[PDB]
Amino acid sequence: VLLLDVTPLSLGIETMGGVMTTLIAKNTTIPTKHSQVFSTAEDNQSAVTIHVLQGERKRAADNKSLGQFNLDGINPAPRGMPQIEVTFDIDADGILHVSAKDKNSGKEQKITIKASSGLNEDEIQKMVRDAEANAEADRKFEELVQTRNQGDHLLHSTRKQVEEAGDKLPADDKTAIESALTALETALKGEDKAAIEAKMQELAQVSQKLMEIAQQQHA
Amino acid sequence: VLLLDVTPLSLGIETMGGVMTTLIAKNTTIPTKHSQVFSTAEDNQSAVTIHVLQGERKRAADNKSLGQFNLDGINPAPRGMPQIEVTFDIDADGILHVSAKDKNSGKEQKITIKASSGLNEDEIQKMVRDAEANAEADRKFEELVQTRNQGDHLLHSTRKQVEEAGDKLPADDKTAIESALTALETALKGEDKAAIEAKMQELAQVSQKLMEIAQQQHA
Amino acid sequence: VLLLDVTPLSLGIETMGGVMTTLIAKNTTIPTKHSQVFSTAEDNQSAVTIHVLQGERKRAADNKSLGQFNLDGINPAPRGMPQIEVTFDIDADGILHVSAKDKNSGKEQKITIKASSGLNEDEIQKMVRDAEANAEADRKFEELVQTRNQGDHLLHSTRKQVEEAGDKLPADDKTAIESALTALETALKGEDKAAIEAKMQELAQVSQKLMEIAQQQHA
Amino acid sequence: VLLLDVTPLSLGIETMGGVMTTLIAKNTTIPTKHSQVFSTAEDNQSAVTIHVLQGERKRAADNKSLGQFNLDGINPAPRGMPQIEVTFDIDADGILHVSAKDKNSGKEQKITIKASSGLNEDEIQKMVRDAEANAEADRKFEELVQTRNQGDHLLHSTRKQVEEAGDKLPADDKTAIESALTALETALKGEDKAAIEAKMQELAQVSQKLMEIAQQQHA
Amino acid sequence: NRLIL
Amino acid sequence: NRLIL
Amino acid sequence: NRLIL
Amino acid sequence: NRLIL
Question: Could you say which protein family the record assigns here (chains A, B, C, D)?
Answer without folding.
Answer: Belongs to the heat shock protein 70 family.
